[PDB]
From a paper:
The LBD is crucially involved in most of the receptor functions because of its capacity for hormone binding, dimerization, and interaction with coregulators. To allow the crystallization of ERα bound to the environmental molecules acting essentially as partial agonists that are unable to induce a stable conformation of the LBD, we used the ERα-Y537S LBD mutant described previously by Nettles et al. (2008). The structures display the canonical active conformation, with helix H12 capping the ligand-binding pocket (LBP) and the SRC-1 peptide bound to the “AF-2 surface” formed by helices H3, H5, and H12.
Whereas BP-2 acted as a full agonist of both ER subtypes, ferutinine was a selective activator of ERα, and α-ZA efficiently activated both receptors with a slight preference for ERα. Some ligands, such as BP-2, α-ZA, BPA, and TCBPA, adopted a binding mode reminiscent of that used by E2, with two phenol groups hydrogen-bonded to three polar residues located at the two ends of the LBP, namely H524 (H11) on one side and E353 (H3) and R394 (H6) on the other side. BP-2, which displayed the highest agonistic activity among the molecules used in this study, occupies almost the same volume as E2 in the LBP and therefore imposes similar side chain conformations. In particular, it stabilizes the same conformer of H524 as that seen in the E2-bound ERα. Among the 12 compounds tested, only 2 displayed a fully AF-1–independent activity. These 2 compounds are BP-2, which acted as a full agonist of the entire or truncated ER forms, and more surprisingly, chlordecone, whose partial agonist activity on ERα also relied exclusively on the AF-2.
Residue numbers in the entry:
A (entry chain B): 305 to 461, 470 to 549
B (entry chain A): 306 to 335, 337 to 461, 467 to 549
C (entry chain G), D (entry chain F): 688 to 696
Write the structure that this text describes.
Amino acid sequence: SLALSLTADQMVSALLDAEPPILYSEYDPTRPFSEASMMGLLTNLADRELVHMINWAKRVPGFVDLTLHDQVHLLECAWLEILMIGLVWRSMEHPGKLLFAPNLLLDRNQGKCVEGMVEIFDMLLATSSRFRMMNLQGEEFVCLKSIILLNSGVYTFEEKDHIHRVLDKITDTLIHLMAKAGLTLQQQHQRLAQLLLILSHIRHMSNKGMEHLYSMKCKNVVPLSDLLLEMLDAHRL
Amino acid sequence: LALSLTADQMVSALLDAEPPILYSEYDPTRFSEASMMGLLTNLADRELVHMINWAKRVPGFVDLTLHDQVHLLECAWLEILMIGLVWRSMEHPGKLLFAPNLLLDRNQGKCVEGMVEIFDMLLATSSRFRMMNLQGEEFVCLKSIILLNSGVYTFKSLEEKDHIHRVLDKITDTLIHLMAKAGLTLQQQHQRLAQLLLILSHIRHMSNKGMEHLYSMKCKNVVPLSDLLLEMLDAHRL
Amino acid sequence: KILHRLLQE
Amino acid sequence: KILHRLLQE
Ligand SMILES: O=C(c1ccc(O)cc1O)c1ccc(O)cc1O
Ligand SMILES: O=C(c1ccc(O)cc1O)c1ccc(O)cc1O
């Protein structure tokens, strides 16, 4: 694979270039929020981000080397995690708020408008606070997001070794980034650990988020697009 | 205290704190859904009591308020049970060693509704452990990391949050120590550290699914759960 | 499967 | 809670 032949700097350049854009919601401020309309903004937003995600994933070194069935499985497993980390990233500079879109910045009080949602907002806000605490860098962020894509479904499987080789390359990349940043050898491994342990929390929020979306579906709160329905069905809740 | 320990001292403390491997009450001459589930929940309840005593021996844990200790244990308890199970089953490809007299292969998970999916994830993790040749010293580090990490984000007591992060760094230092001592290069130490920590993501996933499964068994009244077990289950408010 | 098709476009 | 009691024992 040519992905295994990339240098650290080339890796970061590829990932940075593949970044999807920040999208807008169709928030209509002429009418008051209801549970239904807030959740509708979120489900509409998620569907649009998904399309850009699908195309972002294809630009992640090593991903297109996999069979369509493997690509499908990885994205099925990680999609909400990837949406969430992007959200937390976007919200870093807005303490107490979640920047779903530039025209949709919500605080926890607004989150209470949807049943079971505030719990998820709270976890998302705590993670954003953690990013701030660590001063997470953009280059580190894109590495983390790619790790989630390749790792989350990897153990639901020679293609395994290829995935782990790419993952090792990204580890190399993170270290290289920390070193160039002037972190000592000890700080390098300590930060690497701090960053990867965040992924455990991101998985957790995803699992809860999946159950939450499922509940919205089974209560007919909002209609989900066919795509969103299939991504959800894949977690068979 | 904990922050004063050396890498070798941390390893020793963690190894000495290890809980015992329990036996099942299982009568091997008799398996129904209610049968198998009762055995698992009975085992889980007993392992939990030992886990609580073990947590107290993890360096840094008793420095936290009672409230914070409860929170961490409530969040991580099934992760901790599961990684222990995976570790015990490591040398038994295709089987889950719940106890020395309770070694269940993949197909026996089918005796319980929705259990086989969980079995498959646990087995895949054990295989990953084998593939990496996970060591006992690394295992106990990982298990301590889960205790301190899983509920740490969901915490004027940020000095307690920062203290926990300092202890977490120490455990990271300890993992690296073990790897350098094993003769791994610098590049290999960082790669292996990452590989180990990424496993914790899968373990969190399995815990979440396991918690929903246990809950679905609770509302089927097929198996009676101990008071302690119901309290741990209810802390996840599903 | 929609995703399967979207991954080809 | 049982846990709180066990942590104090
Ligand atoms: O976090 C969510 C989310 C939604 C849309 C989006 O573009 C990004 C998101 O992280 C989210 C989606 C559905 C749900 O039920 C709960 C969520 O937190
Ligand atoms: O993983 C489980 C488990 C049970 C008992 C035990 O001693 C260890 C375990 O990991 C487990 C328990 C209950 C349940 O519904 C699902 C599980 O995976």
